[PDB]
Amino acid sequence: GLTYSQTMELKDSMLQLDPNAKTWIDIEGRPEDPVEIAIYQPNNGQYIHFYREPTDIKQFKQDSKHSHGIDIQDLFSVQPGLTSAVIESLPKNMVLSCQGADDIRKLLDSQNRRDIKLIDVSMQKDDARKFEDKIWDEYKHLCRMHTGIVTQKKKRGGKEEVTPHCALLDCLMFEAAVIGSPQIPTPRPVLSRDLVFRTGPPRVVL
Ligand SMILES: [Ca+2]
Ligand SMILES: [Zn+2]
């Protein structure tokens, strides 16, 4: 799990969030086995974003192919235990905005955070992604984990290749849809990379 200095840094980093500010939350993966979480405050730009290795490899392969496009191999070096640690430290009675609340509600309740309230902004699914292309054009550098091809079924038949779903860029584009343009304030990560990923192997000497 997390060490001591680590945990204290995580808690300090999160205090950078304004407990009364508008805050989006989005996850990828099922709520019992999430693989990517983002918590984003558009007014000040601050976001908490991290990953988790799945326990169910089979369901993970389907989500990779039909939702997030993450390669399981790229999750082998994430820091364990962040999901429970972050959820435990969220401010009391915080009000979070989301696009579809049912799975997030289950995740939060599973961690005994029934005090956190959810506002389902309830945009139609295409409207919610109006600014998808613009947000990837501008912010792709903020998450490079979505490497695989993603296809989804259309209701009225057939399938199509779509842009992969990223918890972070989904928050950014949902804010863009609400404000009617991609001109959100500059987003900035609150977590250091060393809290998100295990220390990598030593660099190759080139
Ligand atoms: Ca999403
Ligand atoms: Zn992502």
Q: How would DSSP label each residue in 79-112?
A: PTTHHHHHHHHSPTT-EEEES--HHHHHHHHHTT
Q: How far apart are CA 174 and CA 34, in angstroms?
A: 20
- Binding positions for Mn(2+): 26, 28, 170
Q: How far is the CA of 66 from the centre of ligand 1 (A)?
A: 12
Q: Which residues are annotated as a binding site?
A: 26, 28, 36, 143, 146, 166, 170
Distance from C-alpha of 27 to C-alpha of 170, rounded to nearest angstrom: 9
Method: X-ray
Ligand 2 centre distance from Cα of residue 70 (Å)? 8
Long-range contacts, stretch 175-178, CB < 8 angstroms, 24+ apart:
175/24, 175/40, 175/42, 176/130, 176/131, 176/134, 176/135, 177/123, 177/127, 177/128, 177/129, 177/130, 177/131, 178/121, 178/123
Please tell me what resolution, in angstroms, this structure has: 1.5
Rounded to the nearest angstrom, the distance between the alpha carbon of 194 and the centre of ligand 2 is 17
Phi, psi of 99 (to 5 degrees): -105, 90
Sign, CA dihedral 116-1-202-73, equals negative
In angstroms, the Cα distances linking 159 to 40, 43, 93, 130, 154 are 31, 37, 41, 20, 5
* CB crowding 61-79: b at 16 or more within 10 Å, else e: eebbebbbbbeeeebeebb
Residue 44 DSSP code: T
- As a whole number of Å, the CA-based R_g of the chain is 17
Task: Say if CB 65 and CB 148 are below 8 A apart.
Answer: yes
Distance (Å) from CA 62 to ligand 1 centroid: 15
CA of 166 to the centre of ligand 1 (A): 6
Q: Which ligand approaches the C-alpha of residue 147 most closely? A: 2
Phi, psi dihedral angles at 16 (to 5 degrees): -70, -20
